């Protein structure tokens, strides 16, 4: 679950 | 503990 959450956060950070 | 911290960080990132 942490891996999925961190992947989403990393995608969001890369978008910004 | 890392899961709780990362969840908080993800909530903060989603807020911004």
PDB file of C-alpha atoms in Angstrom:
ATOM      1  CA  UNK A   1       0.000   0.000   0.000  1.00  0.00           C
ATOM      2  CA  UNK A   2       2.864   2.374   0.802  1.00  0.00           C
ATOM      3  CA  UNK A   3       4.407   1.559  -2.576  1.00  0.00           C
ATOM      4  CA  UNK A   4       1.215   2.484  -4.404  1.00  0.00           C
ATOM      5  CA  UNK A   5       0.803   5.679  -2.368  1.00  0.00           C
ATOM      6  CA  UNK A   6       4.435   6.693  -2.921  1.00  0.00           C
ATOM      7  CA  UNK A   7       4.143   5.978  -6.637  1.00  0.00           C
ATOM      8  CA  UNK A   8       1.121   8.256  -6.813  1.00  0.00           C
ATOM      9  CA  UNK A   9       2.930  10.953  -4.840  1.00  0.00           C
ATOM     10  CA  UNK A  10       5.980  10.649  -7.110  1.00  0.00           C
ATOM     11  CA  UNK A  11       3.797  10.961 -10.208  1.00  0.00           C
ATOM     12  CA  UNK A  12       2.192  14.073  -8.708  1.00  0.00           C
ATOM     13  CA  UNK A  13       5.601  15.567  -7.871  1.00  0.00           C
ATOM     14  CA  UNK A  14       6.917  14.828 -11.368  1.00  0.00           C
ATOM     15  CA  UNK A  15       3.828  16.525 -12.809  1.00  0.00           C
ATOM     16  CA  UNK A  16       4.677  19.711 -10.881  1.00  0.00           C
TER      17      UNK A  16
ATOM     18  CA  UNK B   1       5.300   4.727  11.192  1.00  0.00           C
ATOM     19  CA  UNK B   2       6.606   5.349   7.671  1.00  0.00           C
ATOM     20  CA  UNK B   3       3.166   4.481   6.305  1.00  0.00           C
ATOM     21  CA  UNK B   4       1.488   7.058   8.529  1.00  0.00           C
ATOM     22  CA  UNK B   5       4.098   9.700   7.680  1.00  0.00           C
ATOM     23  CA  UNK B   6       3.826   9.003   3.943  1.00  0.00           C
ATOM     24  CA  UNK B   7       0.037   9.123   4.124  1.00  0.00           C
ATOM     25  CA  UNK B   8       0.248  12.530   5.767  1.00  0.00           C
ATOM     26  CA  UNK B   9       2.744  13.728   3.165  1.00  0.00           C
ATOM     27  CA  UNK B  10       0.521  12.430   0.351  1.00  0.00           C
ATOM     28  CA  UNK B  11      -2.502  14.214   1.815  1.00  0.00           C
ATOM     29  CA  UNK B  12      -0.457  17.423   2.007  1.00  0.00           C
ATOM     30  CA  UNK B  13       0.722  17.021  -1.597  1.00  0.00           C
ATOM     31  CA  UNK B  14      -2.823  16.343  -2.811  1.00  0.00           C
ATOM     32  CA  UNK B  15      -3.970  19.480  -0.983  1.00  0.00           C
ATOM     33  CA  UNK B  16      -1.441  21.554  -2.958  1.00  0.00           C
TER      34      UNK B  16
END
